[PDB]
Every structure is written in structure tokens, then in C-alpha cells.
Coordinates of C-alpha atoms and ligand atoms in Angstrom, one line a residue:
Chain A
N291 CA 0.0 0.0 0.0
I292 CA 0.8 3.7 -0.1
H293 CA 0.8 6.0 2.9
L294 CA 1.2 9.6 3.9
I295 CA 4.7 10.7 4.8
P296 CA 4.6 10.9 8.6
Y297 CA 4.1 14.3 10.3
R298 CA 3.4 15.9 13.7
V299 CA 0.4 18.0 14.6
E300 CA 1.9 20.8 16.8
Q301 CA -1.3 22.7 17.6
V302 CA -4.9 23.2 16.5
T303 CA -6.4 26.7 16.9
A304 CA -9.1 29.0 15.9
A305 CA -6.7 31.9 16.0
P306 CA -6.1 33.0 12.4
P307 CA -2.4 32.9 11.4
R308 CA -3.0 35.5 8.6
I309 CA -0.2 35.0 6.1
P310 CA 1.8 32.1 7.4
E311 CA 5.5 32.4 7.7
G312 CA 6.2 29.8 5.0
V313 CA 4.2 31.7 2.4
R314 CA 6.1 34.8 3.3
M315 CA 9.5 33.0 3.5
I316 CA 9.3 31.8 -0.1
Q317 CA 8.3 35.3 -1.2
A318 CA 4.9 34.4 -2.7
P319 CA 3.3 37.7 -1.8
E320 CA 6.0 39.4 -3.9
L321 CA 4.7 37.5 -7.0
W322 CA 1.0 37.8 -6.4
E323 CA 0.4 41.0 -8.5
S324 CA 2.4 39.8 -11.5
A325 CA 1.0 36.2 -11.2
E326 CA -2.7 37.3 -10.7
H327 CA -2.5 35.4 -7.4
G328 CA -2.3 32.1 -9.3
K329 CA -5.6 32.6 -11.2
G330 CA -6.2 30.1 -14.0
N331 CA -4.6 27.1 -12.3
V332 CA -6.1 24.0 -10.7
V333 CA -3.9 22.1 -8.3
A334 CA -4.9 18.4 -7.9
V335 CA -4.4 17.4 -4.3
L336 CA -4.1 13.6 -4.0
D337 CA -4.7 13.1 -0.3
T338 CA -7.3 12.4 2.4
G339 CA -9.9 14.7 0.9
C340 CA -10.8 18.2 2.0
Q341 CA -13.3 20.1 4.1
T342 CA -14.9 21.7 1.1
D343 CA -17.0 24.2 3.2
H344 CA -14.0 25.4 5.2
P345 CA -14.4 29.2 4.9
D346 CA -10.8 29.6 3.7
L347 CA -11.2 27.0 1.0
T348 CA -14.8 27.0 -0.2
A349 CA -14.3 29.5 -3.0
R350 CA -11.3 27.5 -4.2
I351 CA -12.8 24.0 -4.7
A352 CA -13.1 23.3 -8.5
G353 CA -14.3 19.7 -8.1
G354 CA -13.1 16.4 -6.8
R355 CA -13.7 12.7 -6.7
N356 CA -13.6 10.0 -4.0
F357 CA -11.6 6.9 -4.8
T358 CA -11.8 5.4 -1.3
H359 CA -14.5 3.3 0.4
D360 CA -15.5 6.1 2.7
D361 CA -19.1 7.2 2.5
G362 CA -20.1 4.0 0.7
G363 CA -17.5 4.7 -2.0
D364 CA -19.8 7.5 -3.4
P365 CA -17.4 9.2 -5.9
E366 CA -19.1 12.6 -5.2
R367 CA -18.4 12.6 -1.4
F368 CA -14.8 13.6 -0.8
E369 CA -14.7 15.3 2.6
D370 CA -11.8 15.0 5.0
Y371 CA -11.9 12.9 8.1
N372 CA -8.1 13.0 8.8
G373 CA -7.2 16.7 8.4
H374 CA -4.0 16.3 6.4
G375 CA -5.6 16.9 3.0
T376 CA -7.3 20.0 4.3
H377 CA -4.0 21.3 5.6
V378 CA -2.3 20.7 2.2
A379 CA -5.1 22.5 0.4
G380 CA -4.7 25.6 2.5
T381 CA -1.0 25.9 1.9
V382 CA -1.6 25.6 -1.8
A383 CA -4.5 28.0 -2.1
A384 CA -6.3 29.3 1.0
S385 CA -8.2 32.3 -0.2
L386 CA -7.3 35.9 0.4
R387 CA -10.3 37.2 2.4
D388 CA -11.1 40.4 4.2
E389 CA -12.0 38.2 7.2
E390 CA -9.0 37.0 9.2
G391 CA -8.2 33.4 8.2
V392 CA -5.1 32.0 6.5
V393 CA -3.9 32.6 2.9
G394 CA -2.1 30.2 0.7
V395 CA 0.7 30.5 -1.9
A396 CA -1.7 30.9 -4.8
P397 CA -4.9 32.2 -3.4
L398 CA -6.7 32.5 -6.8
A399 CA -5.7 29.1 -7.9
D400 CA -8.4 26.4 -7.5
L401 CA -8.2 22.9 -6.1
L402 CA -9.2 19.5 -7.4
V403 CA -9.8 17.3 -4.4
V404 CA -8.6 13.8 -5.4
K405 CA -9.4 11.7 -2.3
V406 CA -7.2 8.6 -2.5
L407 CA -6.4 8.0 1.2
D408 CA -8.5 6.6 4.1
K409 CA -8.7 8.3 7.5
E410 CA -5.4 6.6 8.5
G411 CA -3.6 8.1 5.6
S412 CA -3.4 4.8 3.6
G413 CA -4.4 3.9 0.1
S414 CA -3.9 1.2 -2.5
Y415 CA -1.7 1.5 -5.6
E416 CA -4.9 1.1 -7.6
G417 CA -6.3 4.2 -5.8
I418 CA -3.3 6.4 -6.4
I419 CA -3.2 5.3 -10.0
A420 CA -6.9 6.1 -10.4
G421 CA -6.4 9.5 -8.8
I422 CA -3.6 10.5 -11.2
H423 CA -5.7 9.4 -14.2
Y424 CA -8.5 11.5 -12.9
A425 CA -6.3 14.5 -12.2
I426 CA -5.0 14.4 -15.8
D427 CA -8.4 13.8 -17.5
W428 CA -10.8 15.9 -15.4
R429 CA -12.3 18.9 -17.2
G430 CA -14.3 21.6 -15.4
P431 CA -17.2 23.6 -16.7
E432 CA -15.3 26.6 -18.3
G433 CA -12.1 25.1 -19.7
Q434 CA -10.7 24.3 -16.2
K435 CA -8.1 21.6 -16.0
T436 CA -5.4 20.4 -13.7
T437 CA -2.1 22.4 -14.1
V438 CA -0.2 20.9 -11.1
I439 CA -0.5 17.5 -9.2
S440 CA 0.6 17.4 -5.5
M441 CA 1.3 14.3 -3.5
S442 CA 2.6 13.9 0.1
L443 CA 2.7 10.1 0.0
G444 CA 4.6 7.0 -1.1
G445 CA 4.8 3.3 -1.4
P446 CA 7.8 1.0 -1.2
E447 CA 7.9 -0.6 -4.7
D448 CA 7.4 0.3 -8.3
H449 CA 4.2 -0.4 -10.3
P450 CA 4.1 -0.1 -14.1
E451 CA 0.8 1.7 -14.1
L452 CA 1.9 4.2 -11.5
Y453 CA 4.9 5.1 -13.7
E454 CA 2.7 5.2 -16.8
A455 CA 0.3 7.6 -15.1
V456 CA 3.0 9.9 -13.8
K457 CA 4.6 9.9 -17.3
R458 CA 1.3 10.7 -18.9
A459 CA 0.8 13.6 -16.6
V460 CA 4.2 15.2 -17.3
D461 CA 3.8 14.5 -21.0
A462 CA 0.5 16.5 -20.8
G463 CA 2.5 19.5 -19.4
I464 CA 1.5 18.9 -15.7
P465 CA 4.3 19.0 -13.0
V466 CA 4.0 16.1 -10.5
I467 CA 5.2 17.1 -7.1
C468 CA 5.9 14.7 -4.3
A469 CA 7.3 15.0 -0.8
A470 CA 10.6 13.3 0.1
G471 CA 10.3 10.5 2.5
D472 CA 12.5 3.4 1.5
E473 CA 8.9 2.9 2.6
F474 CA 7.8 5.9 0.6
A475 CA 10.1 5.6 -2.4
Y476 CA 7.4 5.7 -5.1
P477 CA 6.4 7.8 -7.0
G478 CA 9.0 10.3 -5.7
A479 CA 11.8 8.2 -7.1
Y480 CA 10.7 8.6 -10.7
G481 CA 13.0 10.9 -12.7
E482 CA 9.9 12.9 -13.9
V483 CA 8.6 13.7 -10.4
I484 CA 9.7 16.9 -8.6
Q485 CA 10.7 15.7 -5.1
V486 CA 10.7 18.3 -2.3
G487 CA 12.7 18.3 0.9
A488 CA 12.1 20.5 3.9
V489 CA 13.9 23.2 6.0
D490 CA 12.8 24.9 9.2
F491 CA 12.4 28.7 9.5
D492 CA 16.1 28.9 10.4
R493 CA 16.9 27.4 7.0
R494 CA 18.2 24.2 8.6
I495 CA 17.8 20.9 6.8
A496 CA 15.1 19.0 8.8
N497 CA 17.4 7.5 -0.3
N498 CA 16.1 10.9 -1.3
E499 CA 16.6 12.6 -4.7
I500 CA 15.8 16.2 -3.8
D501 CA 15.0 18.8 -6.4
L502 CA 14.6 21.7 -4.0
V503 CA 13.5 22.5 -0.4
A504 CA 10.8 24.6 1.1
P505 CA 9.5 25.3 4.7
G506 CA 8.1 22.3 6.5
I507 CA 8.3 22.9 10.3
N508 CA 5.5 24.6 12.3
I509 CA 3.4 25.3 9.2
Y510 CA 0.0 26.7 10.0
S511 CA -2.8 26.0 7.5
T512 CA -6.4 25.1 7.4
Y513 CA -7.6 22.1 9.3
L514 CA -10.8 20.2 10.1
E515 CA -14.0 21.8 11.5
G516 CA -13.1 25.3 10.1
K517 CA -10.0 25.4 12.3
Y518 CA -6.3 25.8 11.7
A519 CA -3.4 23.6 12.6
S520 CA 0.4 23.8 12.7
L521 CA 2.0 20.7 11.3
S522 CA 5.6 19.7 11.0
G523 CA 7.0 17.1 8.6
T524 CA 9.1 16.8 5.5
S525 CA 5.8 16.7 3.5
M526 CA 4.6 20.2 4.6
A527 CA 7.1 21.6 2.2
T528 CA 5.5 20.1 -0.9
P529 CA 2.3 22.2 -1.0
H530 CA 4.5 25.4 -1.0
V531 CA 6.1 24.2 -4.2
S532 CA 2.8 23.0 -5.8
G533 CA 1.2 26.4 -5.2
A534 CA 4.3 28.2 -6.3
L535 CA 4.1 26.5 -9.6
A536 CA 0.7 28.2 -10.3
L537 CA 2.4 31.6 -9.8
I538 CA 5.5 30.6 -11.9
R539 CA 3.4 29.2 -14.7
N540 CA 1.3 32.4 -14.9
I541 CA 4.3 34.7 -14.9
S542 CA 6.5 32.6 -17.2
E543 CA 3.9 32.0 -19.9
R544 CA 3.2 35.7 -20.0
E545 CA 6.9 36.7 -20.1
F546 CA 8.0 34.1 -22.7
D547 CA 4.7 34.6 -24.5
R548 CA 4.3 30.9 -25.1
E549 CA 2.8 27.8 -23.4
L550 CA 5.6 26.2 -21.3
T551 CA 6.4 22.5 -21.3
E552 CA 6.7 20.7 -18.0
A553 CA 10.5 20.9 -18.3
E554 CA 10.4 24.6 -18.7
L555 CA 8.1 24.9 -15.7
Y556 CA 10.6 22.9 -13.7
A557 CA 13.5 25.1 -14.9
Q558 CA 11.6 28.2 -13.9
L559 CA 11.0 26.7 -10.5
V560 CA 14.7 25.9 -9.9
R561 CA 15.7 29.3 -11.2
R562 CA 13.6 30.6 -8.3
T563 CA 15.8 29.0 -5.6
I564 CA 18.7 30.2 -3.5
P565 CA 21.5 27.9 -2.4
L566 CA 21.7 27.4 1.3
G567 CA 25.3 26.2 1.5
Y568 CA 24.6 22.5 2.0
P569 CA 25.4 19.7 -0.5
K570 CA 23.0 19.3 -3.5
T571 CA 22.2 15.8 -2.2
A572 CA 20.7 17.5 0.9
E573 CA 19.1 20.7 -0.6
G574 CA 18.9 19.9 -4.3
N575 CA 18.9 23.3 -6.1
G576 CA 18.2 25.1 -2.8
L577 CA 15.4 26.9 -1.1
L578 CA 12.4 28.1 -3.0
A579 CA 12.8 31.9 -3.3
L580 CA 10.3 33.2 -5.7
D581 CA 11.4 36.9 -6.0
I582 CA 15.1 36.1 -6.6
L583 CA 15.2 37.2 -10.2
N584 CA 14.0 40.7 -9.2
Chain B
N531 CA 13.5 20.4 -47.6
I532 CA 15.6 21.2 -44.5
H533 CA 18.5 23.7 -44.7
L534 CA 21.3 25.2 -42.6
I535 CA 20.3 28.4 -40.8
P536 CA 22.1 31.2 -42.8
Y537 CA 25.5 32.3 -41.4
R538 CA 28.5 34.3 -42.7
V539 CA 32.1 33.1 -43.2
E540 CA 34.2 36.0 -42.0
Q541 CA 37.8 34.6 -42.5
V542 CA 39.7 31.4 -43.1
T543 CA 43.1 31.2 -41.4
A544 CA 45.9 28.8 -40.5
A545 CA 46.7 31.0 -37.4
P546 CA 43.8 30.5 -35.0
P547 CA 43.4 31.5 -31.4
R548 CA 44.2 28.9 -28.8
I549 CA 41.1 29.5 -26.6
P550 CA 38.4 31.2 -28.7
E551 CA 36.7 34.1 -26.9
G552 CA 33.3 32.5 -27.0
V553 CA 34.6 29.5 -25.0
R554 CA 36.1 31.9 -22.5
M555 CA 33.0 34.2 -22.3
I556 CA 30.7 31.3 -21.4
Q557 CA 33.2 30.4 -18.6
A558 CA 33.9 26.9 -19.8
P559 CA 37.6 26.9 -18.7
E560 CA 36.3 27.6 -15.1
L561 CA 34.5 24.3 -15.2
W562 CA 37.1 22.1 -17.0
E563 CA 38.8 20.6 -13.9
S564 CA 35.6 19.8 -12.1
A565 CA 34.0 18.5 -15.3
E566 CA 37.1 16.6 -16.5
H567 CA 36.8 18.6 -19.7
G568 CA 33.6 16.9 -20.6
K569 CA 35.0 13.4 -20.6
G570 CA 32.2 10.7 -20.7
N571 CA 30.0 12.6 -23.2
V572 CA 29.3 12.1 -26.9
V573 CA 27.8 15.0 -28.7
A574 CA 25.9 14.1 -31.9
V575 CA 26.5 16.8 -34.4
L576 CA 23.7 16.7 -37.0
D577 CA 25.2 18.8 -39.8
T578 CA 27.2 18.7 -43.1
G579 CA 29.7 16.0 -41.9
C580 CA 33.1 16.7 -40.4
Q581 CA 36.7 16.7 -41.5
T582 CA 37.5 13.6 -39.4
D583 CA 41.3 13.9 -39.9
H584 CA 41.4 17.5 -38.7
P585 CA 44.2 17.6 -36.2
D586 CA 42.0 19.2 -33.6
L587 CA 39.1 16.7 -34.1
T588 CA 40.6 13.4 -35.1
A589 CA 41.1 12.1 -31.5
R590 CA 37.5 13.1 -30.6
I591 CA 35.5 11.2 -33.4
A592 CA 33.5 8.4 -31.9
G593 CA 31.9 7.5 -35.2
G594 CA 29.3 8.7 -37.6
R595 CA 26.9 7.9 -40.5
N596 CA 25.9 9.6 -43.7
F597 CA 22.2 10.1 -44.5
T598 CA 22.8 12.4 -47.6
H599 CA 23.6 11.8 -51.2
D600 CA 27.1 13.2 -50.9
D601 CA 29.6 10.5 -51.8
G602 CA 26.8 8.6 -53.6
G603 CA 25.0 8.0 -50.4
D604 CA 27.7 5.8 -48.9
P605 CA 26.6 5.6 -45.2
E606 CA 30.3 5.2 -44.1
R607 CA 31.5 8.4 -45.8
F608 CA 30.7 11.4 -43.7
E609 CA 33.5 13.9 -44.4
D610 CA 32.6 17.6 -44.8
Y611 CA 32.5 19.4 -48.1
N612 CA 30.8 22.5 -46.8
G613 CA 32.8 23.5 -43.7
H614 CA 29.9 24.3 -41.4
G615 CA 29.8 20.9 -39.7
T616 CA 33.5 20.9 -39.1
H617 CA 33.2 24.4 -37.5
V618 CA 30.4 23.3 -35.2
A619 CA 32.3 20.2 -34.1
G620 CA 35.3 22.3 -33.1
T621 CA 33.3 24.7 -30.9
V622 CA 31.8 21.6 -29.1
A623 CA 35.0 19.7 -28.6
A624 CA 38.2 20.7 -30.4
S625 CA 41.0 18.9 -28.5
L626 CA 43.3 20.6 -26.0
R627 CA 46.7 20.2 -27.7
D628 CA 50.2 21.5 -26.8
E629 CA 50.8 22.4 -30.5
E630 CA 48.6 25.2 -31.9
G631 CA 44.9 24.6 -32.8
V632 CA 41.8 25.8 -31.1
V633 CA 40.1 24.2 -28.1
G634 CA 36.4 23.6 -27.7
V635 CA 34.0 23.9 -24.8
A636 CA 34.3 20.2 -23.9
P637 CA 37.7 19.1 -25.2
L638 CA 37.4 15.6 -23.8
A639 CA 33.9 15.0 -25.0
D640 CA 33.7 12.8 -28.1
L641 CA 31.8 13.6 -31.3
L642 CA 29.3 11.5 -33.3
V643 CA 29.2 12.8 -36.9
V644 CA 25.6 12.5 -38.0
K645 CA 25.8 13.8 -41.6
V646 CA 22.2 14.9 -42.5
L647 CA 23.0 17.9 -44.7
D648 CA 24.8 17.8 -48.0
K649 CA 27.6 20.0 -49.4
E650 CA 25.1 22.7 -50.1
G651 CA 23.7 22.6 -46.5
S652 CA 20.4 20.8 -47.6
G653 CA 18.7 17.6 -46.5
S654 CA 15.5 15.7 -46.4
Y655 CA 13.1 15.5 -43.5
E656 CA 13.5 11.7 -43.7
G657 CA 17.3 12.0 -43.3
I658 CA 17.1 14.3 -40.3
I659 CA 14.6 11.9 -38.7
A660 CA 16.9 8.9 -39.4
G661 CA 19.9 10.8 -38.1
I662 CA 18.1 11.6 -34.8
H663 CA 17.2 7.9 -34.3
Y664 CA 20.7 6.9 -35.2
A665 CA 22.1 9.2 -32.5
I666 CA 19.6 7.8 -29.9
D667 CA 20.5 4.2 -30.8
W668 CA 24.2 4.5 -31.3
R669 CA 26.4 2.7 -28.8
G670 CA 30.2 2.8 -28.4
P671 CA 32.6 0.0 -27.7
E672 CA 32.6 0.5 -23.9
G673 CA 28.9 1.5 -23.7
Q674 CA 29.3 5.2 -24.6
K675 CA 26.1 6.8 -25.8
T676 CA 25.0 10.1 -27.2
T677 CA 24.5 12.6 -24.4
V678 CA 23.6 15.8 -26.5
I679 CA 22.2 16.3 -30.0
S680 CA 23.2 19.5 -31.7
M681 CA 21.5 21.0 -34.8
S682 CA 21.7 24.2 -36.8
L683 CA 19.0 23.6 -39.4
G684 CA 15.3 24.0 -40.1
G685 CA 12.4 23.5 -42.5
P686 CA 8.9 24.9 -42.8
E687 CA 6.9 21.7 -42.5
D688 CA 5.7 20.0 -39.3
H689 CA 6.3 16.3 -39.9
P690 CA 4.9 14.2 -36.9
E691 CA 7.8 11.7 -37.5
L692 CA 10.3 14.5 -36.7
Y693 CA 8.4 15.6 -33.6
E694 CA 8.3 11.9 -32.5
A695 CA 12.1 11.6 -33.0
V696 CA 12.8 14.6 -30.9
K697 CA 10.5 13.4 -28.2
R698 CA 12.1 10.0 -28.2
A699 CA 15.5 11.7 -27.7
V700 CA 14.5 13.8 -24.7
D701 CA 12.6 10.9 -23.2
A702 CA 15.9 9.0 -23.5
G703 CA 17.6 11.7 -21.5
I704 CA 19.2 13.5 -24.4
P705 CA 18.9 17.3 -24.8
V706 CA 18.2 18.4 -28.4
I707 CA 19.7 21.8 -29.2
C708 CA 18.8 23.8 -32.3
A709 CA 19.8 27.3 -33.5
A710 CA 17.2 30.0 -33.6
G711 CA 16.3 31.4 -37.0
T712 CA 8.9 33.7 -43.0
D713 CA 9.0 30.4 -41.1
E714 CA 11.3 28.6 -43.6
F715 CA 13.5 27.3 -40.7
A716 CA 10.7 26.7 -38.1
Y717 CA 11.1 23.0 -37.4
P718 CA 12.5 21.3 -35.4
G719 CA 13.4 24.4 -33.4
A720 CA 9.7 25.2 -32.8
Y721 CA 9.0 22.0 -30.9
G722 CA 8.5 22.6 -27.2
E723 CA 11.1 19.9 -26.3
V724 CA 13.9 21.5 -28.3
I725 CA 16.3 23.9 -26.7
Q726 CA 16.5 26.9 -29.1
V727 CA 19.6 29.1 -28.9
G728 CA 20.0 32.7 -29.9
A729 CA 23.2 34.7 -30.4
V730 CA 25.0 37.7 -28.8
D731 CA 28.3 39.4 -29.6
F732 CA 31.2 39.9 -27.2
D733 CA 29.6 43.1 -26.0
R734 CA 26.5 41.2 -24.7
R735 CA 24.3 42.6 -27.4
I736 CA 21.8 40.6 -29.4
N737 CA 11.4 32.4 -32.5
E738 CA 11.0 30.7 -29.0
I739 CA 14.3 31.4 -27.4
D740 CA 15.6 29.4 -24.4
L741 CA 18.9 31.3 -23.9
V742 CA 21.7 33.0 -25.9
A743 CA 25.4 32.4 -26.4
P744 CA 28.2 34.0 -28.4
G745 CA 27.6 33.8 -32.1
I746 CA 29.6 36.6 -33.7
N747 CA 33.1 36.1 -35.2
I748 CA 33.5 32.7 -33.7
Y749 CA 36.8 31.0 -34.5
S750 CA 36.8 27.2 -34.9
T751 CA 38.0 24.4 -37.0
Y752 CA 37.4 24.4 -40.8
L753 CA 38.1 22.5 -44.0
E754 CA 41.5 21.4 -45.1
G755 CA 42.9 21.4 -41.6
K756 CA 42.4 25.2 -41.3
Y757 CA 40.3 27.4 -39.1
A758 CA 37.6 30.0 -39.7
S759 CA 35.7 32.8 -38.1
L760 CA 31.9 32.4 -38.7
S761 CA 28.8 34.3 -37.4
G762 CA 25.3 33.2 -36.6
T763 CA 22.8 31.5 -34.2
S764 CA 24.3 28.2 -35.5
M765 CA 27.6 29.4 -33.9
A766 CA 25.9 30.1 -30.6
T767 CA 24.4 26.6 -30.5
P768 CA 27.5 24.5 -30.2
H769 CA 28.6 26.5 -27.2
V770 CA 25.4 25.3 -25.5
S771 CA 25.8 21.7 -26.7
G772 CA 29.4 21.5 -25.4
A773 CA 28.4 23.3 -22.2
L774 CA 25.9 20.6 -21.5
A775 CA 28.6 18.0 -21.4
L776 CA 30.3 20.0 -18.7
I777 CA 27.0 20.6 -16.8
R778 CA 26.1 16.9 -17.0
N779 CA 29.4 15.8 -15.5
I780 CA 29.3 18.3 -12.6
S781 CA 25.6 18.0 -11.9
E782 CA 25.4 14.2 -11.9
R783 CA 28.3 14.2 -9.4
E784 CA 26.9 16.9 -7.2
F785 CA 23.3 15.6 -7.1
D786 CA 24.7 12.0 -7.0
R787 CA 22.2 10.7 -9.5
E788 CA 21.6 10.5 -13.3
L789 CA 19.9 13.6 -14.5
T790 CA 16.8 13.6 -16.7
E791 CA 16.7 15.9 -19.8
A792 CA 14.5 18.3 -17.9
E793 CA 17.2 18.6 -15.1
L794 CA 19.9 19.1 -17.6
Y795 CA 17.9 21.9 -19.2
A796 CA 17.2 23.4 -15.8
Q797 CA 20.9 23.3 -14.9
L798 CA 21.7 25.0 -18.2
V799 CA 19.2 27.9 -17.8
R800 CA 20.2 28.4 -14.1
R801 CA 23.7 29.2 -15.4
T802 CA 22.7 32.4 -17.2
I803 CA 22.8 36.1 -16.7
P804 CA 20.1 38.5 -17.9
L805 CA 21.1 41.1 -20.5
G806 CA 18.2 43.6 -20.1
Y807 CA 16.2 42.4 -23.1
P808 CA 12.7 40.9 -22.9
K809 CA 12.6 37.1 -22.4
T810 CA 11.0 36.8 -25.9
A811 CA 14.4 38.1 -27.2
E812 CA 17.0 36.6 -24.9
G813 CA 15.1 33.8 -23.3
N814 CA 16.6 33.0 -19.9
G815 CA 19.7 35.1 -20.7
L816 CA 23.3 34.6 -21.6
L817 CA 25.1 31.4 -20.8
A818 CA 27.5 32.0 -17.9
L819 CA 28.6 28.7 -16.6
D820 CA 30.4 29.9 -13.4
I821 CA 27.8 32.5 -12.4
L822 CA 26.9 30.7 -9.2
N823 CA 30.3 31.9 -8.0
Ligands
NA2002 NA1 -8.9 32.7 3.8
NA2003 NA1 43.4 21.7 -30.7

């Protein structure tokens, strides 16, 4: 089976952490005007589902599907019972509201809730494969389609249909982002996948093949019951990268005046990093730093 | 039909520079020790052939094949009757010799001479397609393989077989480089997967451009064991192709893994500086291999 990369829940609160430090650390607000806050993107979150009426997320939900046995296996019921998927969603794209809540990296990007994990954070290879297929093929009512796939999970062994699905996504121009973890090797091990490691807010580094790092310690985002939670784990870094790609895609396609291939989106991501002074085996290309070219 | 991107021959000489300024400007010498001069790479040069007994190139030639009607179409005859292919080859990988001669960007990289253009610089779509597949499938005697494909050519027609050949190459981990150029040279440069290179002069002054490199008064090897200064986007292109051999070596060691084509491309465009032009004109900027220092 496949499982969430383990993480810790530090705190659950109703106190709004307005713009969380990780969003600020990677310099997302510095890109919001130029990137139209990520508008025109759909990030497919393959996870435990989402609280789709969370005030900070409700305007961002573009659609979703349930591939678990929760709720009788009803494909149209994809709410979150674990909390992790809701937290991911908020880092990617919690709305910018006048009311005090949180705000994500790409607050005008929308979310495709691809529920592939049970309440314990576990799923089958068949389920993750199905979720990737759906993420690629889904089409929303006004031309909407997935532009980034985000995963915080892994399984120990390869599967030909998992590889085929990942390759089909990148061949369609869709970056596939996965958290660094042997128990969680796949799909993060595939060459095509962008694998994300974590630092803390001191920029310290918290079997991997890292492409870059982002903040992963004491990350406040949305959580169950309309609340917020601070989570720590290697995988909290991944949604920062997935949301950032919505911003980077918007800016780069405008500046180059062309549709970008997945390889170009990857290159524009790693151009927006700073080295931290650690070996590339530990930090990859460095820390996500979105305003570095300015 | 496919043709060479137009260029100018400025001078032919038997008294060339030792290190051409374009090689210096992109900061290749700064990477030579760390990259072992590009050892462990084979750059497939898809062009007019090569003078394979040129003193600066003879120790670099890994092999080749002819897909043109030069020499009656003999596949094992791939010498250059034009000069352009020999010039490209020398910018990629002219050997570092004690005696005179020029030196390329990656002087221990080897060259696969994929002759797809005839003496006049012309070739068929079928021949370019066959040359790309040949480059992908070629294997050397100790398992060497093509690590970069380099082209300076174009035609107006979009043949799906040519797109598929380029896609096969990048999926095999091989960057495919083509010079930038009403659309008579559009393909294969226009395909999203191809890295398209524009040109600057040595004063940093200046399609779907990915980056730029020096392309004005570039000295390299030429016919009859001589040397020549040429100008054009097809002169910027081999600087990028040779640079990728250096980047591949350093990056695979530093990341401690084999890099995908997308990672090689990212490492290339990370090693640039902006020149103040729009990205539609300079792409990601000017190749500057040591800029991260
Ligand atoms: Na909000
Ligand atoms: Na030489």
C-alpha cells in the first residue's frame, strides 16, 4: 500500500495565522500581483480529501472525486476525516479574504480534491493510479483543467501503471510534485517527479533525490472543523512548491509569450531558488525563493 | 526540404586562437577541472559532416553515419565538403593540444558525426529523422552513448515523425539543441522539447528562445585542416551543446544521480545572466557557466 509521509500535529487553533510564515519565507506575496495570485490554475491534491466548506477553501474548490471506500464509495463525497488533505489544500491556495483566516501560496488558484487515502492516511496502488488518471483527465465547466499535481505520500515498490500515469501527466505538461520520505520511495523516485525536501524557518535541513527544499516545520494552514493547525514534517514543504508553480506558470507563460512545457516549468522553479550552503544531495537546487530574479 | 540556418564566413586562417573568446566568455575553462573537460560525453552533431582527420578533431571522433547523397550516399562516408559541420564540431570539442589549434567547450567529449546535410547545406526530413534515431540508438565500444544532440537547421513543415524523433531523444535523457532562425526554418526548433539558442556578440548585445550564447566572429576548425571565423545563431548553438557535457558531469556528481533531460535543461538555464532584453528576445539570458560563484 501507499501512505502519507509521517508528520506531527503541533497545535490546533481558531486563531487566524493571517499570512503564514512559510508563504512569506518563499516570497509568494512578492509575486501575487504579477501572477494574478495564481488565477487560471487547478492544483490536484491527491490526499485524504478536503473540508470543502471550510471558509478559507470553499471558493477554491473546483471539483473532486472520492476513490476510497469512505461514504459508501460514493465518488461525489470527498470530505476530509483525517485533516492532512485540508491542511495541504490551505497551503496551496487558501483564499485571500477580508475576514481573518489564512492565505495560501496561490490564493486565486483552484483545487481539485482527489481523495485517494483513508482516515489513517493509507491507500492502494490502484487508488493512487486512479487519482492520477482523474487528475489528468478531469475537465471543469469553463475550460478548467489540472495544471499541477501534488502528493505527500509514497509506497515502497514500483508499479508499471503508477509510472505510466506519472509519465502521462508530465507529457501533458503537468508537473507532478511529491514529498521526500525506503517505505515511501514511489512515486517520488521517478525521474519525472519533482521531489521536495524541507527546512525549518532557520533554513536548517530538517534514499532521497531532492530537487529543492521549502519550509516544513511549524506550518500553519487550514484544518478540520473550520479550524487551523500547525503541522511539521518533510511533506509540509510540498504544497508550498505546488502552489508556487501556479504563480510561476502564470508569470512565465506571459513573459515568454508561449505555453511552457513541463521541463520549462521545472526550470523556472529551480531558477527561483537560492543555495543554502549544503550539498546538493541534501538541498537539491536550494530553497524556494520566488522573488530572486528581481 | 531542410537547410542550414544562414550564417556568414568571415575569415579562413591557419593561425587561430588557442582559446576562442566564446569558449572563455561562457566560462567553460572555469568548469574544466571539475567536469574533467567533458569526458564521458558524446555530442551528436547533425550537420554537413566533419573533417574527421582534422588535427583538432581526429582524436574526438566516436563514429558517424551519412544520410545524404554526398559520396553517392555511402553511409560510411561522412566527411565535410561544406565546412559548417567541421566548425560546429570544433566549438563543441576541439582537443586541447600543446601544439597550436583551437580548443572547444568540452575538449574531452567525443563527437558523433551525423551527416544529415549535403555539401550545399540541404537535407530531407527523412534524413534528419533517421539521423536523430541513429544518434539515440548509437552505442560505443565500452557503452558510450549520445548525451547531447546538436542541430543548426530548419524547414517549414511539421512532420509528426520528426516531432516523435525529438520526443524520443528527450525521453531517452538527451537534450536536443537547435539554433534559432517567414517560417522557412521553423522546425524542429519550434517543438517545445527542443532547446532553441540565440546569439550575442562579445559586448553582450543581441522564435521561441531558451537562452543565448556567443555567435559573432566565432573561430573554430574548418576544412583542409584550417580554421575559420563564422557568425550566426548556429555558432551560438555548439557553445550550449558543449556546455551541456560539462554541466552533465558536474551535476550528476553533485546531485549523486543520473539527471533527466529536464534537469539538464534546468541546470543550463540556471547558469545564465540577464542582458536587459525581454525574455521573448534573450530567453533566460546569456550562458555564464560559473555565475553561481
Ligand atoms: Na482565507
Ligand atoms: Na586543438
